[PDB]
């Protein structure tokens, strides 16, 4: 048994500071290689994370189930923990396809966590075989605000899971809201997946999605075409530099999707 792990599970920051001062180690791990820092992050217990880091907890330890403290913080949703770990050099890019921080945060709709992972150099387009891109999982789970954050950041609107594009996952889902969104960022409506099928063919007979994929089977407006082209010139999370252009404010906001 372990008082340090036990205190960290429940967010007992007083018990933790007590244990530390009596001489208990902070880098103690179980047989599964779980440290008290892992458990603190899992619970989103920011005070306990601070205390453990101050006393030299390791931020990149990997459990037997391939979880890192950063991964757990992404499960908890505590943006403060995620941020704090990123500051202390938590590795953004894991080794396991079973515990990808950016995907877990995306499937759970933890936008702010996603945002930070990208900011710290994470690959926004990381394509894991059996999951897809973070864009793809956010779509599958109908996480509207992750999708909009990912697209705005410069995520490739067409990379999903295998040959199945995000527009496909969205069609199965029947999300009219997410469909419009993907199309604003240039999703290909004419793409075929592993079954040869196109997105329109996966949407219920009774939906306006069918009319949406087909009424907009024509070409986008020239303004839409110019926007896609201009945004294509900026790197991930650089689109804000559109501010520095000599252009009417109305158009900067259009390019920024605001």
């Amino acid at each position: 048994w372990s008082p340090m792990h036990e205190a960290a599970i429940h967010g007992h920051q007083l018990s933790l500071r007590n244990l530390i001062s009596q001489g208990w180690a902070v880098n103690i791990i179980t047989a599964d290689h779980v440290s008290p820092l892992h458990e603190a992050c899992l619970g989103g217990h920011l005070s306990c994370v601070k205390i453990l880091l101050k006393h030299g907890a390791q931020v990149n330890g990997v459990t037997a189930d391939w979880h890192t403290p950063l991964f757990n913080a992404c499960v908890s949703g505590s943006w403060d923990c995620v941020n704090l770990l990123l500051q202390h050099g938590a590795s953004v890019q894991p080794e396991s396809d079973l515990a990808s921080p950016i995907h877990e945060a995306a499937r759970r709709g933890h936008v702010e966590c996603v945002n930070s992972l990208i900011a710290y150099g994470g690959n926004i387009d990381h394509k894991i075989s059996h999951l897809g891109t973070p864009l793809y999982l956010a779509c599958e789970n109908q996480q509207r605000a992750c999708v909009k954050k990912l697209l705005e950041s410069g995520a490739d609107v067409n990379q999903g899971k295998g040959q199945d594009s995000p527009l496909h996952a969205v069609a199965r889902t029947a999300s009219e809201e997410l469909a419009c969104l993907l199309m604003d960022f240039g999703a290909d409506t004419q793409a075929k997946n592993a079954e040869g099928k196109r997105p329109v063919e996966l949407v219920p007979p009774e939906s306006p999605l069918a009319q949406l994929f087909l009424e907009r089977e024509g070409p986008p407006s020239l303004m839409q075409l110019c926007r896609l082209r201009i945004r294509k010139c900026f790197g991930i999370q650089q689109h804000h530099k559109i501010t520095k252009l000599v252009l009417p404010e109305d158009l900067k906001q259009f390019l920024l999707h605001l």
Binding site: L222, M223, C226, R227, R229, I230, L247, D250, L251
Partner: protein, 84 residues
């Protein structure tokens, strides 16, 4: 057929029904002067009109409309002013 005239003097003759892709022109409608759109933009704008009309439902795959970055901003301003 209508005459669209750019800012540096070029005259563009296009089919009227094509030029009607611009709501802005549709309003003003046999000779339209454009004191702010330069020839290297207005030419692309006419090409877009042709592209738009031709592919406005041909049950085929619509191909990409090529846009060099160096003209994108002026072209966006034109597309905005022309509502297309």
């Amino acid at each position: 057929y209508v005459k669209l005239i750019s800012s540096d003097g070029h005259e563009f003759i296009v089919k009227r029904e094509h030029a009607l892709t611009s709501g802005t022109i549709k309003a003003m409608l046999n000779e339209v002067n454009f004191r702010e759109i330069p020839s290297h933009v207005l030419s692309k704008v006419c090409m877009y009109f042709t592209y738009k009309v031709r592919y406005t439902n041909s049950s085929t795959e619509i191909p990409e409309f090529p846009i060099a970055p160096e003209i994108a901003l002026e072209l966006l301003m034109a597309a905005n002013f022309l509502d297309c």
